[PDB]
Design an enzyme around this catalytic site. Structure first.
Site, short mmCIF file in Angstrom:
data_model
loop_
_atom_site.label_atom_id
_atom_site.label_comp_id
_atom_site.label_asym_id
_atom_site.label_seq_id
_atom_site.Cartn_x
_atom_site.Cartn_y
_atom_site.Cartn_z
N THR A 1 28.48 41.38 43.07
CA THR A 1 29.65 41.60 42.26
C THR A 1 29.78 43.05 41.81
OG1 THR A 1 28.34 40.54 40.51
CG2 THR A 1 30.15 39.25 41.52
N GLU A 2 28.73 43.83 42.01
CA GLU A 2 28.80 45.26 41.70
C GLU A 2 27.73 46.07 42.41
OE1 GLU A 2 30.03 45.17 36.95
OE2 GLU A 2 29.02 46.85 37.91
N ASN A 3 28.14 47.19 42.97
CA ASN A 3 27.23 48.11 43.64
C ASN A 3 28.09 49.35 43.84
OD1 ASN A 3 24.76 49.00 45.24
ND2 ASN A 3 26.27 49.00 46.90
#
Length: 423
Positions: free
Chosen positions: A323-325
């Site tokens: 969901t985040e990178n």
């Protein structure tokens, strides 16, 4: 041979609401920003609240088939029991656009900011306030009727650490006893949402999962990294299924619920060393020095960490999403490389059987990076804060080609990818 991803794989970008929307006057951050507390930078952000139609068009233009964003609770309830129809229809509107344009949304119900009035009552520190959270959920179940993917909290432990243990974020508290009571209440809050939404939706939670390494080979430090890893990562997620969450003195009993998916937010790795001080739970954390080249906040880049994070998180038998990178640099060439190398590992995870269904790059556009302000640029898309002009960077197009074709091609692998184990 190109690096191929499944057809149904999601290639998206992510934002929150306080970071990109402008003038969020009703939350706790806005307040402390305005009085100059910490909050020591303010926002009107990317003025996404005005330009959303354009940002969505641009998004559709680059070829991204997913968008992870969050609903600002304080907008839907500026004060105590005063609902707001404008905010409601606007987010509802944003959702329609996304759908008519083929972009799968993934909505976060809570992403660090809360209504001021809620915080004034003590927030999630006080279990009784959970009735307010309940009202919010009931109203949001109507707002999201077309959406499928919902995540209750964005990084609950980072939320607890920053504002209750570290005093770095609102409410600016330094208390182990309180930080743990808040975590238990987040787990209850999640259980409450899951109960209310799982019927019509797929309700997950989003966890920041750093790779925690021992500062040395000494067992004293290895034991310390395991402990820290369990304390920041696995005990909280375990509690979702077991119903037990150990605090400083107590073990909180919460009803067992579930999560239909676990969103993994992965950025870098940390080194932990053992200490004598019980206030610090007997360990000291520092950023791991892995790559010679550091990030704008001086973090290391460690692509293999994302594979490890996904692996560790699969222990729960639930589908996973990154969901985040993302990466903050003034050097977009470094970003293309960052993205590709992490995707190679996201791909090997899929190859090794892990159920990964999507990748969301952290940030479609530069935005308000909390306490650090606007200096860090995580965006695929550059934002002029004087004009609000969106200027897509080379990375936005490379990533755009990848999302559109569902594959990383040769030219790109050889130019930026990692040699070993190919993939």
């Amino acid at each position: 041979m190109p690096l191929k991803f499944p057809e149904m794989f999601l290639f998206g970008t992510a934002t929150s609401s306080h970071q990109i929307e402008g003038n969020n006057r009703w939350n706790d951050w806005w307040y402390y920003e305005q009085i100059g507390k910490l909050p020591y930078r303010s926002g009107k952000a990317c003025n996404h609240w005005e330009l959303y139609r354009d940002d969505i068009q641009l998004m559709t233009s680059l070829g991204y088939n997913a968008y992870r964003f969050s609903i600002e609770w304080s907008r839907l309830f500026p004060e105590e029991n005063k609902f707001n129809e404008d905010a409601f229809m606007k987010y509802r509107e944003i959702i329609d656009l996304l759908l008519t344009r083929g972009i799968t949304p993934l909505v976060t119900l809570h992403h660090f900011t809360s209504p001021l009035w809620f915080m004034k009552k003590g927030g999630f520190l006080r279990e009784e306030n959970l009735k307010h959270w309940e009202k919010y959920i009931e109203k949001v179940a109507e707002l999201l009727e077309k959406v499928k993917l919902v995540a209750t909290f964005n990084e609950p432990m980072v939320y607890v650490m920053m504002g209750y243990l570290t005093a770095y974020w609102p409410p600016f508290i330094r208390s182990p006893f309180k930080a743990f009571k808040v975590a238990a209440n987040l787990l209850k809050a999640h259980a409450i949402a899951y109960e209310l939404l799982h019927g019509k939706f797929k309700v997950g939670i989003v966890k920041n999962i750093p790779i925690i390494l021992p500062a040395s080979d000494k067992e004293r430090d290895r034991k310390a990294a395991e402990k820290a890893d369990n304390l920041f990562n696995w005990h909280f997620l375990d509690a979702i299924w077991s119903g037990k969450y150990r605090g400083v003195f107590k073990t909180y009993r919460i009803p067992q619920s579930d999560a239909d998916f676990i969103g993994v937010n992965y950025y870098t790795a940390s080194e932990v060393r053992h200490t004598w001080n019980p206030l610090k739970f007997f360990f000291e954390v520092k950023l791991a020095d892995i790559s010679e080249r550091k990030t704008q906040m001086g973090w290391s880049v460690y692509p293999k960490g994302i594979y490890m994070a996904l692996k560790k998180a699969s222990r729960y038998g639930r589908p996973l999403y990154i969901t985040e990178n993302g990466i903050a640099t003034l050097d977009d060439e470094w970003r293309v490389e960052f993205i590709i190398q992490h995707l190679q590992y996201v791909h090997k995870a899929i190859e090794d059987g892990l159920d990964v269904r999507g990748y969301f790059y952290w940030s479609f556009m530069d935005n308000y990076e909390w306490k650090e302000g606007f200096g860090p640029r995580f965006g695929l898309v550059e934002v002029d804060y004087q004009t609000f002009e969106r200027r897509p960077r080379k990375s936005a197009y490379v990533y755009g080609e990848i999302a559109r074709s569902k594959e990383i091609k040769d030219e790109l692998l050889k130019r930026y990818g990692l040699p070993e184990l190919q993939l």
